[PDB]
Design a protein around this ligand. Sequence first.
Ligand code: 9AM
Length: 515
Amino acid sequence: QYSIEKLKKEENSLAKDYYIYRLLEKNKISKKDAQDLNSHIFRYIGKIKSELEKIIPLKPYINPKYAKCYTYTANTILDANLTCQSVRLNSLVFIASLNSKDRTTLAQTFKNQRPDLTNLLLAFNTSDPMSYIVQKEDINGFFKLYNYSKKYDLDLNTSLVNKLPNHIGFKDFAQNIIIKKENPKFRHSMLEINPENVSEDSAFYLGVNALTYDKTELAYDFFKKAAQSFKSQSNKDNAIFWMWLIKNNEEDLKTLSQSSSLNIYSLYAKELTNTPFPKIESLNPSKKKNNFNMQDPFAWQKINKQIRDANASQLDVLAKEFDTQETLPIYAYILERKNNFKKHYFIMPYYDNIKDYNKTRQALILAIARQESRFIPTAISVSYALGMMQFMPFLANHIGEKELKIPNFDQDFMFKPEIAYYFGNYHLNYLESRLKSPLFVAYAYNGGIGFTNRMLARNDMFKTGKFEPFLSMELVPYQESRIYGKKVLANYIVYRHLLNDSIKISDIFENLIQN
Ligand SMILES: CC(=O)N[C@H]1[C@H]([C@H](O)[C@H](O)CN)OC(C(=O)O)=C[C@@H]1O
């Protein structure tokens, strides 16, 4: 327990934020303490923000240049000068709140200078503003209306849909309606997007979309364009896997099996082609200890800032300094950045705490820890998940106090490897018992067993099918969980291998198909 005066002498960081949040939820931050505190918050988003605002609410902020513009309402906007009228018409809710005659008057005012406003003003004089905006092919208006309400759904012709990808909002638009299975008329219309007009994630998601309609030839073209444009090798591998699954061109599978990225797609391709398992680095530092305190979360924030802001000369001196058994997690963290992510590091720190579990469970624990924290004992996420296993504080207190009844339990115990591993094994036992597959366990570990059960109970998710289970893995409705599951599954395959408990990744996929 650090007092608010001690914390103010620490660097702004997620760890300092976390401890400020702890004072706040304990009601130990007075109104006078809170005055200068917004400057002490590394990330003023989310629960620390709403908690601090129960003490000192911010009424801010309106730009003093446009202050007079917000003293008007729908009833008096025709009294406002021209600049205030245009300012207030940035909000589609404001536009919707006007009456028809005023929208018509304002539409005439702006048809010259701001035809975008005119189109929206007149769209809202109809029973379907989206249909009006689609007929004008007003791309900016289309996305403002989509952001205003997802409920609009409408068929879009070839000319219109091929103009949508040029807008910054298109990637999130397409991802959202495809992985949530919403706006079917939008989704069906995006079959007509020319692959030349999209790239990267947008092209990949349009390939997934094409597969849901069994347009395999259009899907192949989208995935090929994604493969040729993706920046990261991992994503490119994902896209090449789909090219192979659709057309079985064995040069695609060959490229996938030779990839430098270690992921489930390249692992699967290696297995399908009798290609040997990729080389895993071996890290056995001869030195045993140094000065660094692996239980000080402020020291980790400190050194993590340095490492992420180093050239090479600094990386090399850091690598040498943390080349000890004690700081093995930081050593492998540095080495991963030093080698520009081209080498594969799969350490097993604090191994005594798990060496007595069966090797399959050890692999799942290690796979989770690697993805969650890179084995940093004092890791703190932006929602204040804690320690190597990144336990959310609520779940950690339920287990620590109500289940395991640990004497004098504080949530900061999660920063201890033996607690993190013990709690992670305990929690994984709960999830494995309900879900079986390590993939599903991964989804529920990251996103809770709530949405996993909801997703598994749908009849279009991880059932049998031409492209299953791979298609379902692309349609997991939360992007974070979708990615997390693929990454943890790869880690799990690797660790089962290093533990001499190898498993064929093809067996993992067979078990995902519920019959
Ligand atoms: C073991 C555990 O705590 N799992 C939790 C997970 C985790 O904390 C996070 O993935 C760390 N990055 O977060 C959430 C969440 O919806 O916030 C749900 C899970 O119950």
